[PDB]
Design a protein around this ligand. Structure first.
Ligand code: HEM
Length: 146
């Protein structure tokens, strides 16, 4: 888990992004698909589609919102080893069954900070807090078989 200070930092950096959940969620998904083209292929709804098509899809909103809702939950419990364990296990188990591995999460992690910074400059120490959270997810995926 993160420390209370670290969770705090992550939370502070997230609030501005989450404040406009609909628009920022869509944006995050889009950026991922742009930086790492292969990711769209894991999605049922998106495999084969270009970014423009994805942008135009009525399915986009459902997908990005479920992603932000969940990430929000992670940020809000990151400092509780207790909730983290349950959250991480279940997220990792779910994702491996869809065929998603740690490598996909290494990509997310590499682009996250730049994504946040696109919304508002994060506070000092936030970037390391996220890389730390993302690191916990990665380990969970490697423990789940991928
Ligand atoms: C950024 C961190 C991510 C979060 C918080 C997250 C969250 C979720 C959640 C909550 C759902 C299930 C929603 C529901 O059915 O109610 C989901 C499903 C899924 N996610 Fe993720 N996801 C993340 C990253 C990704 C990435 C990187 C991939 C692909 C590379 C992805 C691939 C999948 C797939 C294919 C499903 C199956 C659901 C569907 O396609 O309909 N996830 N994820």
């Amino acid at each position: 888990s993160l420390s209370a200070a670290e969770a705090d930092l992550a939370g502070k950096s997230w609030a501005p992004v989450f404040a406009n959940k609909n628009a920022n969620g869509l944006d995050f998904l889009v950026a991922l698909f742009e930086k790492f083209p292969d990711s769209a292929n894991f999605f049922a709804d998106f495999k084969g589609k270009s970014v423009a098509d994805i942008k135009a899809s009525p399915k986009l909103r459902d997908v990005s919102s479920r992603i932000f809702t969940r990430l929000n939950e992670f940020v809000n419990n990151a400092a509780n080893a207790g909730k983290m364990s349950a959250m991480l296990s279940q997220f990792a188990k779910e994702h491996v069954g869809f065929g998603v591995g740690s490598a996909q999460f290494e990509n997310v992690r590499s682009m996250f900070p730049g994504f946040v910074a696109s919304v508002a400059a994060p506070p000092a120490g936030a970037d390391a807090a996220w890389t730390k959270l993302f690191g916990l997810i990665i380990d969970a995926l490697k423990a789940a078989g991928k």
